[model samples]
Target: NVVIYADGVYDMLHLGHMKQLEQAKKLFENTTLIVGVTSDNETKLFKGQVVQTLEERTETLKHIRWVDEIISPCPWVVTPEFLEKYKIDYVAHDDIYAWLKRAGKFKATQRTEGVSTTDLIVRILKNYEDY
Candidate 1:
């Protein structure tokens, strides 16, 4: 088993987000997705781009067929016990080793990257007619 992990506001839910999650879901047979959604407070503190509420984000993720679970994208966010209970053995993340390491649970065992959801949103807003 491998536990694929990824996190984002996923606010506007763009095509890029879909592609990334779709690619991640195909990583392994025993994949458990641990998605970290930002709390409004956390969002303000970090990204400074608040768009949706936490509960809404949670519910939206529940509808994602590939997602095994959704979690708070907060600092030291995930617990080892939580992963172990769910039988999650490996973790996947974008470039957040130092941040993910704060939990000291699963040290971001896998990695991937792409144009961010935020970037996509910015693209849409900045050039509403271009796209």
Candidate 2:
């Protein structure tokens, strides 16, 4: 069995997120997709405030068919120890982490274009400016 890991803020679970996970799961015939949901504090520190809490984000991932497991409050940095601890065979993401790529543990997935949490937020603010 192959254990694949994918990490993200997942503020407002959308199709793009789903598509990424779908790609991750299908990467191998026998694969377990473990998603790491960044904590509210981490998201705030790096990506600014999130629309959803850690618990909410985790619950959303649980409902996704492609997701096999979830690690809440996952670390931002993917260390060697972290990969060993999770028994991660590959890290599925659109971008590559230098070390992971060199180590042959990175699986690149195509990011869904024209859709994202930021885009949703902008759409709401722009369309409902008076509200």
Candidate 3:
């Protein structure tokens, strides 16, 4: 059995996020997908303000069929200690971490095209009155 970790902000719960999770879950036949949601403070600090609160973000992940477990307010960076604690076999993400990549613990997923949380926000802002 394999335990794959996928961590992100997951601010608006877009198709891109779902696709990434789907890819992670399907990486191995008997894999468990553990999703890590960053804290609101962390999101704000690194990625600016988010549309969804931490609770809401976590709740969204709960509804995804691919996710077997969740870690809310997860650390921004992954460490060997963290992996050992969770028994994580791999870290699946769109972007690869240098250490994890070298360690052969990183799995890269293809990001979905044409849709994203940023695009959604831009659409709303572009048509603010219609929204």
Clashes of each: 0, 0, 0
Clashing pairs in 1: none
lDDT of 3 by residue, 31-104 (tens): 99999999888888877888899899999889999999999989888888999999999999884378899878
Q: If the candidates were sorted by their lDDT against the true structure, best first, what order would they fall in? A: 3, 2, 1
Candidate 1 structure quality by residue, lDDT tens digits, 12-125: 565555666666666776666777676778777867776668777677777777777777653445456655665655455543445346554333323235465667667679
For each candidate, what is the lDDT? Answer: 0.62, 0.90, 0.90
Candidate 2: list runs displaced more than 4 Å: 117-131
TM-score of model 2 (CA atoms): 0.86
Q: Give the candidates in order of TM-score, highest first.
A: 3, 2, 1
Q: Give lDDT for model 1.
A: 0.62
Q: Which segments of candidate 1 are over 4 A away from where they belong?
A: 72-87, 95-131
Candidate 2 local lDDT, 1-131, one digit each (tens): 99999999887888899999999999999998999998888788877878889998898899999999999989988798999999999999883399999989999888887698778778888876685
RMSD for each model, in Å, please?
5.1, 2.9, 3.1
